[PDB]
Design a protein around this ligand. Structure first.
Ligand code: CL
Ligand code: CL
Ligand code: MN
Ligand code: MN
Ligand code: NA
Ligand code: NA
Lengths: 218, 222, 208, 222, 213, 218, 208, 213
């Protein structure tokens, strides 16, 4: 029967894209675990008490990012070009996380913001031009905001560990982030929702810098 | 009316009715475990460095005894049944008990009680036993966090300058643990992560304020 | 320690997750088989009963074997909460076993008989059995209509007394507000439709 | 520690603790009233025109007796307290009781029991009394509606051709009453109006199908 | 340094936002036209049908041009990036096409034939694709329109249609039973099919007991 | 103090618009009660069993609508022009209800749809031109949908009371409504939400007409 | 009947609604007075205490009279549920009475004393009293800061011991999860701020 | 008969929808300009202030023209019909104006003065009004910006500002205490004022104990 033929065909197609869904599920679990490892690793800087080998931690981190580059690059080979916007929602969270941790390492290294390109390169991702994985401007900005929160927390803890120079640099920085985000007319209304938190971050950091200033700490 | 079907549904109405009754009983027992464990947590909040710490700890240890007794009854009521069918009837009470005992145990040892250590006390011989699930554990510990940040702000409020930092470190490790678990655990334990980050923020801000205030050498008198 | 505790717990949750994976595979296979069997059973909505019933029961072999190779890939010493997609498939299988037992014997299959067909001693929850039976009742309502469509004016009258005994049976239960009560609320509608069929036949000279 | 303040907060912790305990007790009593009234409603659904109607009505009347007994206890537990402080602890049980008794009473008299008639039975002498609130009434009646449409579809399912229309008329009047009340009543009773219109639709559709099916003179046999 | 980052980024968000604006305009067009076609057809429940199917066909004439215009509003690679903006009107056009072809031949369009009517590219190569999910969704909409059509068909004195529609809808039911639906919204729309099937089966019942072959 | 002067002024202003809010509250309660009276009155047609003086009911209804015209007209005198879009939300529900009952009476009279103008005239409302109360196209369409539901219900009950002519006219009508709404590109997404129900109404009525047809009732 | 029943109930709900209206008016008046009094009390945040205290207590007259003309426009034989905006105003009044009693005597006003000031025998719920007291504690934290700002380095030290006794007092309560527990959770923060003030003074040679 | 009704109605919904489109464009403009002005000012927390206030003023120059353009997008009578489309950007412009005038004179703008800056009509007659609620909302935004400004002011070495800002914010607190807020969202924004007041009071405390007059 013609109808039955149509539906056995569509059955083949569906099974196929479910194999794709399965593969992507697995790889997303791997990147999620590597993201958790890098997370617990960099979150040692908050316990400033002691040695805290921040440059060493940054090295280990770069390693885990290499692993993320190979796992991530194991996908670009399998699936068609356009498909890489269809299953986006599966790796949106994990991707924004990896962007975050990236910008975190690079800040702990240079006290600046990773250009989006530098991020794609660290993660092993094709630019908007080449076919494969891409870094949605949305995912980028999201990771940057996660970073802003991480840096306000690290500001407080920095003061607690006797570090009075770091809070200042973090104030300057987070302020830069705020002005930049102000330049933007926020498309998407979940991104704007995080932008509402950015203000709380700025205020918190500025308040730390204040609490130092008025007690005679530059 | 005397058919095989009507009779089968008589045995069905009997079986179901029985399970529903046992369920309601476990709901009341769990409610008592919950209320009593909450009162125990308040009592432990009554503590200062003052003389009382000792007799408050023993008194609360009495209360917890009572709670375990309730749990004993629960164990009896269960054995002979598929626990993952009555579980959703005593799970809140169990989370509350874990919160309580882990709170007290932190006060006494400044360390997180383990799941096996919790279960040890939950063995009763005349022999019935009960096992807190890893999820009831994670949830009652998440709850423990809020009580810890409360204790921290309280100790700050009355001079204490060492307790704040201890609660700070401990809470920090616990948070790092929940982050190490991540999406691997049920949505239920993830809903906690938010409140957790809130409590961690409160504690860390407390310690920051102390460090920044106790480090100032004032060259202006009043 | 705290670290040791959370890697321990990470362990428990990892293991349980793997269990959910295996159970997901098995469930997929059983949903496949269940669809196939339903196909081989309707069928009567299209006529030789014993034949298609033999085909169905033969397919049930794959079912029983897939249940046997599961009492191992999972310690029944709990047993876990998730299985509500597991109890979905289980309820479908109950419905199909009751369906076949009805087409052959026109009776209500027993719990004992259903477990004996699927390969269970692991347990078959009462709620799951009654849910399977409710699905049957729905299929039998539909079928009482389609019979008449096909000229079989006799089957609607057997399905009528059967499902009426079912109605009185369920009216004996005191139910909580859960899945079971929700599915049960549909019974009265299945019964109502069958009753409408019986009426249409009666007033048209089939008062037998 | 022996200060006027600490002592005042001792009497406060005592007063509060007392109210919390009385509350929990009223919650368990209300849970039993609820479960028992629900079982009573099921039993009344067991009814057909058959012989049983009578002994089912007396048996259920026994059950309701028991429920009233529970309520008696409740009344005792209350008298000597501001009822609108413990009310939110037995309100569900009261709504369930009203649903039950008004259901039975409709079966027996085909008419809506009044609030005063409900309260009459709720007077106990050895003398304690209880008054269902107009809102507990409206809510338990709203609930009564769903049971009535259930009974209607059941009676249709087993031949009955007069019951459907009676439930239809009664339900229609009740609906017209809830519409006559409108926004004048709490949001709580308004949330019902929706389900009410659903039940009214089910009933009216039943009666429509009957009327249209029993009016056809078939000139084609099989 | 950091400001230049948010400057270029401002550029990209502005560009993409414009892309979404244009896409929205075109989709608004396809939606109006879809309401028009659906009107021509809906006017069948009350009789010249072939005529209505022809008129509907030239309307699809307009639809095709609008789709080719829409192709030039975004990179063909970023298809599923903006798919959600036309998901609805697409499933709806698939429904209208399946509807025309049913009223014409009492058979189900092939996915390829639908793409052909709409003037879009086959799945095989670059261009504008017709997802399997979108197709099956339009087919479910068709099933519903069909149970409705069988009821109104009896009311109109056509006792032939209900039978053919019962056969057809049952066939669709089988076909779907083959599938293993994972997409949630699609599963939901499919739980609605059982209702349509039951409806048409009961119409055929009503015709049969009243001796209407 | 200047600031204090600003705030005592704003205090005057606020108190004022709260007196306006109070007035409108009262009048909305009056129109709500008259709407409930007309509602219970026209809802007697559903109990077709007996006399049901539909023309008489329509007369009483016209009376209550006169009362609505005087109460409603007691507002246009007090408050400024633009204010009559600010406090709209207070009488949106009641206004849509009155539109409904209007269209209901006029259908039970003529089996057609009240032109929006005819409705404003019956309620005692100024057209979009004159200053005062206006009938938002939104409120109009909403009342019309409420009407559609009322007419499907009345269709069923009509059959139950032995009336087999009414269901037909209601089918034709509700179908007209559906086509008309199809002509519209629905602004507002609560109006579209009701439009989703209109489909259920059409189907129900058509099914009644079917159940009659196949049993030999024209 | 059913009609008679629903016009009866329409009656009950209409009456209760009117009651809510009267209570709304009275509440409005009392919120007015409460604002005025708070103004006359801060005040100390701007210096003669006994004077402004006399002004406040004089304003409390309007309060007591408005409470008296309410035990009539409403049968206390319930008493109704809505009053959570009523208990808001009541809690504010408790806070103001405790505030004045503190500025004069530096003690915690008693329940008996508060009812004696507002004109109540109708009752004053314990939860409402404790909530008023918590609001006081907040005002006194703020005030311990502003004192220092104004040069009064002595008041912060009285407020300190007062609010610490308050802390130990509340730590005696076992609370449900309601409004009261939520407000109580702020106490520790008020206490914390006062403690910070005491520290700033001590290390700067005000160890008195 | 019934179709003509929905035809004219289609016309009216199309018209109104266009009105809302135009309104949306203009409001998008006022929003961009508002981000620009807010930038000029925000750049004050790190020093030439009067300059920034002048530049901001000419920016308001642009704002005024855009508002007069917006007036010609809807009937002045239907103001509150579309008020919600610009409610935000309006409260925000009121905030920016109050901000300029505070940095200039350490005083609070009058509502009339705000309308004058924006180039809109007084409440007295026809035109574009400045609601009391919108005004008070912009004033609350100002209070927040001010507690922030006092903190950053201390960090910058300006110990004079915090005191004047404490006085000012306390005055606003009193004024609001006079009011009887009914509008819910406004009440909400006002519960935030207590936080700002507490913040500035604590800054002044910190300055005082450290002997900074
Ligand atoms: Cl100093
Ligand atoms: Cl016939
Ligand atoms: Mn707790
Ligand atoms: Mn019920
Ligand atoms: Na595909
Ligand atoms: Na105004």
């Amino acid at each position: 029967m013609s109808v039955s033929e149509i539906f056995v065909e569509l059955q083949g197609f569906l099974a196929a894209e479910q194999d794709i869904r399965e593969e992507i599920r697995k790889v997303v679990q791997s990147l999620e675990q590597t993201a958790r490892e890098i997370l617990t690793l960099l979150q040692g800087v908050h316990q400033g008490a002691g040695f805290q080998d921040i440059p060493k931690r940054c090295l280990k981190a770069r390693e885990h990012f290499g692993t993320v580059k190979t796992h991530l690059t194991s996908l670009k080979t399998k699936f068609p070009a356009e498909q890489y916007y269809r299953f986006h929602e599966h790796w949106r969270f994990v991707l924004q996380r990896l962007v975050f941790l990236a910008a975190f390492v690079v800040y702990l290294e240079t006290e600046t913001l990773v250009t989006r390109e530098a991020v794609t390169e660290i993660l092993g991702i094709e630019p908007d031009r080449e076919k494969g994985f891409h870094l949605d401007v949305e995912d980028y900005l999201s990771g940057v905001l996660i970073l802003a929160s991480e840096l306000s927390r690290l500001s407080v803890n920095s003061v607690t560990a006797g570090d009075y120079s770091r809070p200042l640099h973090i104030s300057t920085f987070i302020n830069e982030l705020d002005s930049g985000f102000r330049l933007l007319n926020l498309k998407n209304d979940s991104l704007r929702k995080r932008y509402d938190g950015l203000k709380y971050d700025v205020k918190k950091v500025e308040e730390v810098v204040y609490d130092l200033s008025i007690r005679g700490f530059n | 009316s005397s058919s095989p079907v009507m009779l089968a549904f008589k045995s069905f109405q009997q079986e179901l009715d029985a399970r529903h009754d046992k369920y309601e009983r476990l709901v009341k027992l769990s409610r008592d475990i919950t209320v009593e464990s909450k009162r125990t947590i308040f009592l432990l909040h009554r503590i200062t460095s003052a003389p009382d710490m000792e007799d408050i700890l023993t008194e609360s240890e009495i209360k917890l005894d009572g709670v375990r007794q309730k749990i004993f009854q629960v164990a009896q009521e269960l054995s002979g049944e598929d626990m993952h069918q009555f579980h959703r009837a005593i799970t809140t009470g169990l989370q509350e008990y874990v919160e309580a005992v882990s709170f007290q145990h932190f006060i006494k040892t400044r360390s997180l009680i383990s799941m096996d250590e919790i279960n040890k006390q939950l063995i009763f011989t005349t022999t019935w036993r009960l096992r807190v699930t890893p999820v009831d554990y994670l949830l009652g510990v998440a709850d423990l966090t809020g009580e810890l940040m409360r204790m921290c702000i309280n100790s700050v409020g009355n001079g204490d300058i060492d307790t704040p930092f201890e609660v700070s470190q401990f809470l920090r490790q616990v948070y790092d643990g929940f982050s190490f678990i991540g999406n691997t655990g049920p949505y239920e334990v993830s809903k906690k992560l938010y409140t957790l980050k809130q409590s961690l923020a409160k504690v860390e801000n407390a310690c920051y304020a102390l460090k920044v205030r106790g480090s100032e050498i004032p060259k202006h008198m009043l």
